[PDB]
Ligand binder design. Structure first.
Ligand SMILES: Cc1ccc(Nc2cncnc2)c(C(=O)Nc2ccn(C(C)C)n2)n1
Ligand SMILES: [Mg+2]
Ligand SMILES: [Zn+2]
Length: 313
């Protein structure tokens, strides 16, 4: 009850900033996550014994893949922490509780393959979930862990409150399907420009939370250039392996996933920042103005990619 979590001075200061990197020490990440939950939601919201057991089971169900791993989980959760800390008056206690958990669990059991690969392969998960295949599996995995003996971190909540927090987690995890982002951001853009956006309408809150999930999920493009540059090799390692599997199915992969087109990467990153990342952080800054450092850092990395093409690095 009086066992607060503390971080070394550099980490304690740096953790508040959007561009924070959690470092290479796996053992520190559960403590970093707990420190974030206590400052975001309170020392009281979770029973520490049940929380630690939940974290370790979540860790155990992340696989050893180059990008969609346990490190990504904590990175996404930190980004959500930074947003919640800079907009603390906007969210309910249940939302703060639910979103940090949703971020930690959003890629549970990811094997490094896209929904299209699962569909082309004819994987059993594609039969069970027609759309947002992986995302429905990720939420399904989250519910499984919560039902383990001594793992229910929402045990003190009422039946209706528990149903609400689980529904926030479900919608938030489903929102990490990038195919859904395009529509969501288009709809949110119009609501903001026509002044019809109201954060008291629950369906509008859902859409805003969905945008924050995409923003946190892509936050690797909003770090300092050395971090972003190195994390890009990790995502391409997954892309190229998926393309290799596409070729085994007798399908020519898209240039992005073809390891024989490694030279086309800087041009592909420009297309990504222009079509996906910049529009995402732009709309998010309009709806949540303290989230501007994300767009700032994203624009910086776009410029860095332009320098790469121009032979300046
Ligand atoms: C979903 C996702 C999350 C992160 C990503 N990149 C990343 C992460 N961390 C550091 N640097 C970069 C990417 C990504 O580059 N995807 C790409 C590449 C090409 N395209 C087309 C144009 C659509 N999309 N996608
Ligand atoms: Mg995902
Ligand atoms: Zn993710």
């Amino acid at each position: 009850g009086l066992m607060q979590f503390t971080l070394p001075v550099r980490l304690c200061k740096e953790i508040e900033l959007f561009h924070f990197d959690i470092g290479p020490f796996e053992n520190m990440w559960p403590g970093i996550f707990v420190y974030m939950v206590h400052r975001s939601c309170g020392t009281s919201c979770f029973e520490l014994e049940k929380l630690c057991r939940f974290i370790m089971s979540v860790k155990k169900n992340y696989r050893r893949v180059p990008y969609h791993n346990w490190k990504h989980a904590v990175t996404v959760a930190h980004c959500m922490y930074a947003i919640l800390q800079n907009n603390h008056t906007l969210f309910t206690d249940l939302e703060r509780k639910g979103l940090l958990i949703a971020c930690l669990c959003h890629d549970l059991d990811h094997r490094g393959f896209s929904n299209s690969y699962l569909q082309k392969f004819d994987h059993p998960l594609a039969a069970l979930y027609s759309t947002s295949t992986m995302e429905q599996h990720h939420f399904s995995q989250t519910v499984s862990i919560l039902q383990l003996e001594g793992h229910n971190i929402f045990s003190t909540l009422s039946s209706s409150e528990y149903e609400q927090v689980l529904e926030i987690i479900r919608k938030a995890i489903i929102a990490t399907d990038l195919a859904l982002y395009f529509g969501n951001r288009k709809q949110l853009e119009e609501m903001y420009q026509t002044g019809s956006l109201n954060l008291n309408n629950q369906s509008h809150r859902d859409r805003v939370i969905g945008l924050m999930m995409t923003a946190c999920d892509l936050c690797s493009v909003t770090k300092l250039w050395p971090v972003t540059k190195l994390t890009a090799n990790d995502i391409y390692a997954e892309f190229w392996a998926e393309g290799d599997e596409m070729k085994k199915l007798g399908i020519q992969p898209i240039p992005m996933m073809d390891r024989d087109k490694k030279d086309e990467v800087p041009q592909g990153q420009l297309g990504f920042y222009n079509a996906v990342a910049i529009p995402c952080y732009t709309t998010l800054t309009q709806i949540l103005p303290p989230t501007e450092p994300l767009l700032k850092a994203c624009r910086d990395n776009l410029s860095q990619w332009e320098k790469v093409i121009r032979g300046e690095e």
